[PDB]
């Protein structure tokens with residue numbers, strides 16, 4: 001499919017049964033999801049953005065179904081206002097920027 | 100061109116007779132360049148991302164060439180680590196996500 005950028009590119013993702021909405025973010029290196037409990041050992045990582053840095057929990061090798069496509073990757077969890085699907089997961093679904 | 104997300108999607112922009120790198124960001128509503136001098140008056144604007152909000156200077160009708168494609172729109176100048184090209188300008192150059 002082809003997603004245009006007039007509005008925010010939000011797609012439905014299935015994170016362990018739960019269907020949430022997420023933003024396809026090309027400027028985001030990592031994927032960051034809202035504060036929730038994921039199975040596994042986590043590592044505190046500090047990531048910075050526009051405002052400043054935030055403290056997140058880094059979970060390795062988690063699977064997320066981004067718009068009907070199974071993708072595996074590292075998922076950071078922390079105080080974010082919107083679920084962000086970064087480059088790490090995006091590449092798995094073979095997403096491209098065309099213009 | 101068809102850009103893949105294996106690396107940071109950086110392009111060369113020409114703004115004010117000068118070349119500089121910019122990250123093509125689909126998760127960004129606005130185009131935020133780093134602290135630089137621009138002609139014209141500005142207005143106060145407050146945008147927020149991960150880790151809070153910041154104060155940026157909004158300038159309007161700025162000519163900017165993103166990888167050979169001209170675009171004239173609003174540019175925000177603020178304390179950002181990387182020049183960010185947001186949806187506002189991505190739509191002028193006809194940029195789209197595909198997969």
Ligand SMILES: CC(C)(C)NC(=O)[C@@H]1CN(Cc2cccnc2)CCN1C[C@@H](O)C[C@@H](Cc1ccccc1)C(=O)N[C@H]1c2ccccc2C[C@H]1O
Nearest residue numbers: 027028029030047048049050126127128129146148149180
């Ligand atoms: C991995 C992580 C998620 C931390 N990446 C980012 O946040 C990067 C950081 N770099 C910075 C960096 C930091 C350290 C090293 N290298 C680079 C600058 C670019 N952001 C990418 C943005 O796409 C993130 C989004 C998140 C968001 C979307 C909608 C609403 C709230 C938050 C973002 O910040 N978007 C906002 C946005 C962005 C610009 C202008 C206006 C707006 C409003 C909004 O669209």
